[PDB]
Amino acid sequence: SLATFHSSFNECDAAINSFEEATRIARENKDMETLNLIMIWIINFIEVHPEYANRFYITVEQIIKYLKNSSDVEDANIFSNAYKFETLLSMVKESKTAEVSSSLLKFMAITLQNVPSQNFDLFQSLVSYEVKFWKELGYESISDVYEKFLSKTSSSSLRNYDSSIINQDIK
């Protein structure tokens, strides 16, 4: 939470130091379930600030490989989180569209299968990726349908509070 708070004020580097000692504390508790929570926070932070990927002690690809084969039960939302990170990385890595479509397909199917209304954060993220994805392909007609589902001024956690105002201003 303190790490989120620093990332909220763009402190970034101070948030980095805050996060490292969280890893050490998790090990002493020797509890597995919290490690999933700490790992999921990593990429969420790096999603906002991709320029910090090299500084972490674990590369982003290691997490995706780890969380894809995490388990078959007691995950629910982890796999939904897992694949969206792969989709974002796959887009940035300018991979072939066939793989990107498949990777987004996995995350789309898993997110909608469970309750999407309750998981409001991920559902918005799906819309943002899909709108972005289809806009890059040049089919605004598809993007037009999905953008009506994108929530404005909702923004997300750990990314400031006036970011929505700024984003609206840029358009």
Binding site: K96, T97, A98, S101, S102, L105, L137
Partner: protein, 50 residues
């Protein structure tokens, strides 16, 4: 038979192939099963193994 040879002047790339192929829902007596989608006339038009 159509012969659509690759030409540099043809930039009309295809995206339907990149998109994953659809499937079908057919339910048997035991349960509801999942099969790959085939066009209704695709059985006599499909690419021959031969």
């Amino acid at each position: 038979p159509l012969r659509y040879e690759p030409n540099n002047r043809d930039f009309a790339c295809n995206i339907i192939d990149d998109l994953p192929k659809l499937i079908r829902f057919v339910k048997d007596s035991k349960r509801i099963n999942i099969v790959p989608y085939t066009q209704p006339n695709s059985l006599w038009r499909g690419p021959d193994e031969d």
